[model samples]
Target: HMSYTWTGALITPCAAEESKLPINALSNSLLRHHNMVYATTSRSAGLRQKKVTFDRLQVLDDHYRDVLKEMKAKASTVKAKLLSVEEACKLTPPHSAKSKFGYGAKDVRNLSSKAVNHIHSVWKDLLEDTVTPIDTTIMAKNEVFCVQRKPARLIVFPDLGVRVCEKMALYDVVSTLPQVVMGSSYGFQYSPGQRVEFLVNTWKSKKNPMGFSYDTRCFDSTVTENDIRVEESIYQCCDLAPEARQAIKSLTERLYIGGPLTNSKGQNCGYRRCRASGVLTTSCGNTLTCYLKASAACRAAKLQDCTMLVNGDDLVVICESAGTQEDAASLRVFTEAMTRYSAPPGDPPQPEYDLELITSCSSNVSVAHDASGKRVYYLTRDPTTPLARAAWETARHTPVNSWLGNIIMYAPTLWARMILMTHFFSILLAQEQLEKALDCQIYGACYSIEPLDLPQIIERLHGLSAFSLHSYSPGEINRVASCLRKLGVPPLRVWRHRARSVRARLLSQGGRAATCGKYLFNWAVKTKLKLTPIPAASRLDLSGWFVAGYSGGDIYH
Candidate 1:
């Protein structure tokens, strides 16, 4: 069956969009050669539609059924609760899309009587009628990047009232069930620091370790109706209230199975029978399907003790090698099995002997040294895209600050510490907006974070060693240098010199800003201050920072 059946209506935009990065007075301070930076807009939606729409074929074996049985057994042990209207409304992001029924996200969050009443009606309708096709809005996502030439991504979601209802019905199940059923293999349960630790331990626990990342082509499109129903069966196994169970069943049949897509101008676009990108179930459902398929594929390939780390569609498997020739053969068989399950790779999978070389979640584990010369493990990625995004954010104001998110997630990396922190802090100091909270996504949820809180935030997520990490690997250094050259960004030397001035300026402010200078920029100075544990790190309430991935879930925390 096709993932989507179109009505030949174009996906339209509600406002004017910019594809090129807008230049401002401060743009040159971060990056030059601005042509390298661009943003994806609705103009490329037709190109994206062609890539994502396709026929899916799935062939299941005993191994797949066995894994499903095990997952359902574990899922049966959990009891899920229904969230109150007020509580579900509080989870909505401030900038979330408005409902066709008149109220906005802010109104929902404030629990206005009008918003609450409409939400109740939606829930009642969901329970009373289970077979009607739910209406969903289709829009092209505007995302920034280097000139990679990829088209814009699409987001399909229901109205704000229906979204809140989905939360009220499914939030508890989505949040609590995955970790219990999937255990440590749940990728979203780990912070960036914890993720590195898990990878290292998994690598060391193996003999003759070999690993590789699996790149599925258009993962969301590969999901079939059978797969969605199977996912629903797993949820049905959970101990749930009668209303919750009924609501889940109704939503699954109506909204999750297939829905009509309406463009911004209220014209019919098409019908989507595959996974909806912006639903509450998107992340959890994808993780379950990916893990189930990969686990079955591993058994089919006869691999030895394969361990998987999966986040949505991103997957990496580390296992003991059976020599280069046998390992290569095993990978071919593995790819064949995955292709049979309708999740074919974009790039052919290959066996890698080195753990650091096996990239997952678009990041690799790298080695650096602390002040004491002990080896430290941290996550790092290529900085060209991050630099391009930071340059764009520096010039024009945007909804989310990608630079802030990158700095938080990759705090211990050489480029993040040297270039990102220095560039953003300099701009903040000049504008005197250091104390104002800015929005950034962590694990796909929007968070309003202040710049001055970065010191404590980094310490809590990455540990005290983040501040003292130095002597980056030669491979890491070369990658950073290459990215700088590719994007025409200033070299590390320029960043180091600029950091010194920024560090001095921060110290003059005499509060959290001063502490940020003393720690985050210590690598720039010749004589570094003795780095110590931050007192405020223990006081932060960072419960849900990495509990799950919510890429298109429209969640805020």
Candidate 2:
């Protein structure tokens, strides 16, 4: 008789605080072993091992034994780093960080490099000596097996999952079948383990056209035990000729799609809609996840067609389109259809609803404070702003800045300090007369208009601290000056009287006093003070005004 033996391995859970101890211990051991191996290999090759008095051989032996004993301790950290690109990909957000120039391509490159370097380094250090050629081949094959075993399809749902469905069928028939089924069926159902294959009509030839097929499978094991019900799968497939697979791979890798439908319609009226042409439709379920499509009708078709076949209430409807007027219409139709369908079925659980209007008038608010302290408000949604209007203009004419313009124009809440910072120079200049008259440091934080420039400015400041402004409040001004002093910057103070004298001289010499004062102030702020005598006989040079008050006894000309 055959018997099965169950062996339980005791796993002692480490406190979250002690998590790093294992990795640190392993790293120390690895370092010790590496040193020992180098020494041992060196000595065996008739090379004299230098007596550093560290006993590298003994250290290595100790580390090696510890590593062998505590191998499982470091497994979690090692496994996390060794996750496949696909697995890592899932951990990251689907959408890239929004940038003015689009996604941070450079960041992606750096991350990719780090991932590759880590893999190479770990393999070189840990597996180099231990893994033989056969072992390497076996490991590679095992990796391949794991990858192949990964699920081909990732099923998503509504209520409990993503509330959007988007399918991109490359072949003609494959795309057509979904449209046909959606058009024809009031509802559809499937059985457990029963496979439904959507044939991909080939373009190569009638008899043996290069086609593709998709087999729908349930991701939920519990759902599999129940009657297999059909929901909106939003199936997408590409039937590429062997030669086209490379291009398809590139497309999938990039995940680049055309502009949403609202944008496309606002552009040109008649054009063979490129792959980029798409609409966005808001689902009644989730607000964050929206569907995009080329036309409004397609969204309506998707929304109306999806229905629950089983009485278990597992099915969900989705409308994928760009958030446009047409998409809005489709959404309205979907809402109507849903109301009609679920009325007799004693009303299926409805998702929380919130209505939002994407209009040019109600979008964003922009505020500008004039010198008089009057505030001017501009609504980003206003069609009058040429940049705002451009989003509704022809697709090609959509001003790229409109998105940011809207935010800046309307929503002051989203504005960064850097935005005001960028405009500080101009703002100060505008109040130059008042600032000069006050003869006090004018200090206030302002948005830069370009917050992105702040990082570069900060970096430059790190290397070389520069730029200064006056403030009325002595304490605030002193605080800033103190900070500069800490960073090795020299601070100088100018009295109101001295500033006035400089202005008077500049005016008497046929130069604009304000201009002369500004130049002197800027120079004084930038450079360390150097006092030099003004000739008793000659008129004082306006340039010397910058360094006038720095001399010990307040030298009289």
Candidate 3:
């Protein structure tokens, strides 16, 4: 039912040869949606009319409370501080949705009194009351795809006022609490390296662990009011300020529980019955509740030797083998239990003997070689949405630069290293400013990023594992091919050919330039270069930059 939606390919199937299309043919406008990229979204017009998207109910038992109760107590340990106006403003992206109050992001960043005053007023208003849902700007994100294109995903975001409030009331909490409560089960807490280590160790621990990921249908829409109330109850357990507690309660009533939904035309589209997509807490909410239900179900089904890694609805189950029949039946009971809690699997679970066969968090492990031809394992996904969003960013303003984020997250891949790195960085080089620092969001938090430090930064984020990964799955290879064809980017063969000249151009240069050249095109090198740390990256707090948890208190420079 999800069709990976392009994972908006968020959910996919094998493509016919004809399904593969060319990129340059559609390149007249980089923002144009390619028709081949669409799934069932055209039909989504009819689907949106349903008053209730999900058919089941969620029961919050004592077991769920106990898990979340200790969670609140842990969050209370850290003394949370409110961000100063400038600190909050720094997190605002340059292309962030402009304010209706007439102050732009530029004004806020430049220290305009009006911007500071407006922000303060917003927070004050929030503290003054507790029941009104915040107004959000709804927009259609136009994006280009590898082949086909259709409607982009809908994003309904709280206004700058409420967003700043979110930072005040929930940012520290959201950033800190999940990792504390869920441990490795918390999505934002780990990286590709830690994940590979845990997964490999888990599989080896059990000679055979039956593994499967349950895909919840329209995961955000299926959240019930009771589900949200339970989450709010968990939030109340934290040692929040009086104002913060009231704001959370009021926000819950007006926004979190359910609210009216409208598109840009101001026409009533449909009401949100579950968790809305744009809130700061959306990911945390999904992660908390999904883990709650599934963990409870695992206990109920008496799953043996179970270990789960989940990020929101993206889940992976690796457990000791039950008798084949027992695992199958237990999975059915697991689904039934989840469904009773209003989070049913879109597809029934199936067991896998090989952990590599299981994909979680929109990423999977694939094999490729380093510049030295040594085998390397790294994580990657179908490059469909990344290409689309990158193409769109090439021509238009965007909420976040998807291309840069992908390059950071997926730098090791042939697609990222060759296409994304070459294309985007070349544009910057033409401006004669490879050293110019720009800002981009990673894992939903904003940070200033230098183009020069990209290779080093990615190495720190993903590791040497990033430099040589290849030998992708048939699906990854097929999607990679489709993207190359549709994005007007050259093929892998051309990448291999071009990397020589590109690598030569980079290596022939010196300073940050030489280091950038080596790391960015490490696959083309023979004698290895030892990478020194980037001073810019090392200078930052990077405390919240944890692999399996948060950085405790301070988050950035």
Candidate 4:
């Protein structure tokens, strides 16, 4: 297995670095151009500023103040400890964002040689500098939706040194405090399973559960310097050491508030006028503020039985709908309230009357069947990004792996099991590295997870019904077709042929491996009511697999 990384560059050192990165799969060899995915995805978005201003500054406006006012009002309610230098150092991943200072993440984590000195230097700078904005690397992130040869959207995050300092100052508060204040509204704490369960149970509970996702127009861009200061005020509400508090505020002013945006060349692209895409605080900051704005809006709109699920800027509102006219009017009011709070809807908050229509985290519940023809529901998406990213994973190492996470979460889906799993595992097999576990991220935290664990994970995440599910939507089929053609992967019939061989091998070995083999591949076979694991029980690291070390200290939790 490759070593676990806590912190490393989020930018793709996207290179043909691993000349040996999985070049071939079972029926299909990769059709990728060297770093084409990386190059294309991280290309410039062409958003230039006339002179640098809030065009990129992450500032606080009156809406920010209004939102943060209540946030500070509750700060003392949940207590937090300022992590010591050692604690912060320990959490730094052995491989996190690369450092320009010749200090690796392990060196920083171990506090040996000059690494400690360098970290101290970085920390001192944080304490000393406020006016000088930290320089950030800007790259295109292939997140969200996928399109053919699409240019990656831009994201700007601080360097390794600034990132660690961020952990020392804000990690504890972000990790522990939000749950105390936000509860169910906080999306980071919930897994996909819990998220779905909440949605379904609530849907049934409410006679009218009107649902819709509110998209804020350029949520990152909208956060101004005032917004950051407002966030800083909330952070200060927690009791923190004087040094830590100063460090956090300085970080806020220098890195979080506004920073220099640098391109692949060493040129100064300009200054960030809004919230940068690459920050530990971005997701949580958006979530907290989103919830704050949304909760108030819901109350003001008097949307009955209103409950929300928020992940950063992604929102799905489930409430008792009054009627077509009343719902429209209520939505208008909600939009007005959110706009008044600087949280205007990007997509205009169109309501989905049906539960299946509501999608969040790029996942929606869709029906399919397992091996035994039993009904099953699994979370799925268009698979465009999956195929696109898988092609990238097949061709090179990504800064953040989306394939593993998507497969783990959507294990039972035909495309994931047949296409993604087959492609990746075949490469791993070729590499003689089946024992190796790739990294998959949840929320923003990272985990080293084995594909072998998918069965147990799916059982826990979706239910055993996943094993028997053998169906997929027509839309999924079309998505699958697009993926296969680009992937140079063989037809579906060929994969099922391959699955039979894979399944038999695992079954021959028996034990938990056998169980996984049976559960994961059953949907691919015609064998009916055929098998079950003989072992009384099997257990392993079900969910305690968090791997983001020191660097992840604050946010990964």
Number of the top lDDT candidate: 1
Better of 2 and 4 by lDDT: 4
Report lDDT per candidate.
Answer: 0.92, 0.21, 0.65, 0.65
Error of 2 at 414 (Å): 16
Ranking by TM-score: 1, 4, 3, 2
Model 4 deviation from the true structure expressed as Cα RMSD, one decimal place: 6.4
TM-score of each: 0.99, 0.19, 0.81, 0.82
For candidate 2, lDDT tens digit of each residue in 1-557?
00011122111111111101122221321111211110011112111111100110101123223322232232212211122333322322222222121223233233455433443343233222322111000000000000102211111111100001011112221222222322211111111101011111111112322111111111111111011111111211222333223322322222111111111112221111111111111111011001111112223334332221110112222223333444445544544432322111123223211111111112322333322345433222222232212212212121122323332322221111112221222223433531231110000101112322222222221111111212213332343344323322223332223334443444354433333233332323333233222122133232312111111111111
Error at 24, model 1, angstroms: 0.5
Q: What is the lDDT of residue 55 in candidate 1?
A: 90
Candidate 1 is scored at a TM of: 0.99
Predicted candidate 3 versus true structure: per-residue lDDT over 235-297, tens digit per residue: 766666777787778778877876655554445554555666677788778887888787888
Best by TM-score: 1
Worst 10 residues of 3 by lDDT: 3-12
Name the weakest run of 10 consecutive residues (lDDT summed) in model 1.
141-150
Candidate 4 structure quality by residue, lDDT tens digits, 1-557 = 10111122233433323222244442234343323333343322442221112322222345445645666677767666767667777766556766778877777777776776777788888888767878887765444333343334666777777777777777777776666556676666665666666778777878877887788776766665566676777777887888888888888888777766665555665666566667767766777767877877887788898888777778878899888888888889988888776666667777778777788877776667665676555677767566656765665666567888887777767788886666665566457555666676766666667666766666666666656666577766776776666545577888787777767766776765667567777766776456453333256545433211122222332
Q: Write the per-residue lDDT of candidate 1 for residues 1-557, one digit (tens) a residue.
A: 99999998999997999999899988887788888888999899999999999998889889889989999999999899999998899999999999999999999999999999999999999999989999999899998888758899999999999899999989889888889888888899999999999999999999799999999899999999988999999999999999999999999999998899999999999999999998999999999999999999999999999999999999999999999999999999999999998889999998998888988999999999988999998899988888888988988888899999999999999999998999999999999999999999998889999999999999999988999898899999999998888888888999999999999999999999999899889999999889888898899999978888887888898
| lDDT value, residue 258 of candidate 4 | 72
- In model 3, the Cα lDDT at residue 265 comes to 45
